[PDB]
Amino acid sequence: PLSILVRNERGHSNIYEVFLTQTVDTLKKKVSQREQVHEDQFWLSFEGRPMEDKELLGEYGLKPQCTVIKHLRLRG
Amino acid sequence: VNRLDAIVWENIEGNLSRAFLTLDLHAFFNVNKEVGDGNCFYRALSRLHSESRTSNEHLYYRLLIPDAVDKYFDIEPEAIGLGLNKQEYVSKAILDGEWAGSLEASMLSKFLDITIIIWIVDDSGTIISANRYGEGRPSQAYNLCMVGNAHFDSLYIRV
């Protein structure tokens, strides 16, 4: 049970709890509910690598207090 | 102009770099408002690619997408990030009025060898961030204004 930051589209970080044995979509769902934004409207990267829905969180080299970046899908 | 070219962008991923800053939009650019027909993204590229300043190539710019997909979609962080299906995406993206933005900026910046910057504006019309797709400076870039997270207008850099 790791604590991390997800930096939002405004450049501001928010603390999320995460399990390395769980897939990336678990964190998508946490961000989606807390920041009021549909899952298919954003993606996450970590150290410049895109995170993928069915990849385990532990495969990305996550650490306590590390930062994931949220990327809005921009459409207009 | 002078100021915008002094911005050091932060590299993030692929050819995407980013800036956090507040600007008065009208002080730095003139805006040509685009119509609400689903095509603003491609209208703005058409308008910005040429001094005659017309959006009537918008269909042509849209028709670049299948070819850019062949070249790049397999490697676009956003497509990968969102787990998009290639064939699903290409079929929708070519339809009249289908919205576009960050993914097509990423593909086309590369495909045409240009720099596209989407400047993000809050409720009050203040630029609050920007995404730059490419390595060029803003004075040379295709500058777009993103409004209400649902529309783009074209920006002409002011002098």
**Could you give the CA distance from residue A16 to residue A14 in angstroms, rounded to a whole number?**
7
CB-defined contacts A:B, below 8 A: 65
Which residues 6+ apart lie within 8 Å of B105 measured at CB? A74, B41, B116, B118, B131, B133
At B115, is the secondary structure helix, strand, or coil?
coil
Which of B12, B77, B101 is nearest residue A76 as measured by Cβ atoms?
Answer: B101
Domain count, chain A: 1
Q: In what order do the strands lie in the sheet with A13-18?
A: A13-18, A2-7, A67-72, A42-46, A49-50
Least Cα separation, residue A25 to chain B (angstroms): 10
What is the longest distance spanned by two Cα atoms in chain B?
44
How many other β-carbons are positioned within 10 Å of the β-carbon of residue B36?
11
> Residue B154: which of B65, B8, B40 has the closest Cα?
B40
Domain boundaries, position A74: 1-76
Distance CA A3, CA A45 (A): 16
Q: How many structural domains comprise chain B?
A: 1
CATH number of residue B58's parent domain: 3.90.70.80
**Deposited experimental method:** X-ray
What is the span of the domain harbouring residue B109?
A: 1-159
CATH number at residue A64: 3.10.20.90
- With CA atoms as reference, the chain A residue closest to B129 would be A10
- Find the length of chain B: 159
Assigned token pair, B93: 């993206």
